[PDB]
Design a protein around this ligand. Structure first.
Ligand SMILES: C[n+]1cn([C@@H]2O[C@H](COP(=O)(O)OP(=O)(O)OP(=O)(O)O)[C@@H](O)[C@H]2O)c2nc(N)[nH]c(=O)c21
Length: 179
């Protein structure tokens, strides 16, 4: 048992699509569909959980995994000055290598000490299945930041780390969406 800097709570939202929300209503929809999965406290639980995750593409379009630091609410409302760094991974093979890199960088405080100078700017990581006509295995990763200013630093850091983990320029695309 080797404790993480902070424990992270893993939740699941099945087939969370904007069209399913259109009949439901966000908090009314989130609290009604969210399923608790695990409370990750140590490195050993981190790898057990990550290596046991069911494939996002075998679950519906919009199936989402949320990793929340200290079990905080993963709401747009809670991060007014924040942003979402996006990573879209095209194939199932690259999605695993990418997901492993990003989650290890976040829960392992790699981003904290390499980019944020010791500040805990990232409190949420979201993993979504988002297949489109063109790419049916497309998985989206979201690195939620409390401060938008850090996005310019997180994007090249994540790009380099994915490239180093063996992903090519065509295996993933970097993006950003504000709150
Ligand atoms: C997590 N979340 C989801 N929604 C709503 O739920 C819908 C589906 O939720 P989503 O999380 O699948 O959309 P996402 O932002 O990833 O996709 P994109 O914006 O199309 O790139 C969204 O379109 C919102 O209307 C949300 N709406 C608000 N206000 N706040 C939230 O925290 C929030």
């Amino acid at each position: 048992a080797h404790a993480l800097k902070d424990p992270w709570f893993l939740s699941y939202i099945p087939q969370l699509t904007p069209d399913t929300v259109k009949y439901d209503f966000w908090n009314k929809a989130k609290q009604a569909l969210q399923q608790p999965l695990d409370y990750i406290r140590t490195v050993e639980e981190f790898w057990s959980t990550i290596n046991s995750l069911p494939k996002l593409h075998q679950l519906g379009n919009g199936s989402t995994f949320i990793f929340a630091r200290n079990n905080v609410d993963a709401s747009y409302e809670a991060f007014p000055n924040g942003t979402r760094v996006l990573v879209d991974l095209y194939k199932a093979s690259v999605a695993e290598k990418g997901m492993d890199f990003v989650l290890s960088s976040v829960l392992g405080e790699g981003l904290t000490y390499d980019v944020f100078n010791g500040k805990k700017v990232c409190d949420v990581v979201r993993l979504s299945s988002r297949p489109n006509q063109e790419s049916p295995e497309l998985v989206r990763l979201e690195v939620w930041l409390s401060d938008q200013l850090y996005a310019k630093d997180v994007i090249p850091y994540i790009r380099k780390g994915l490239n180093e983990a063996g992903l090519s320029f065509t295996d993933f695309i970097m993006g950003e969406s504000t709150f």
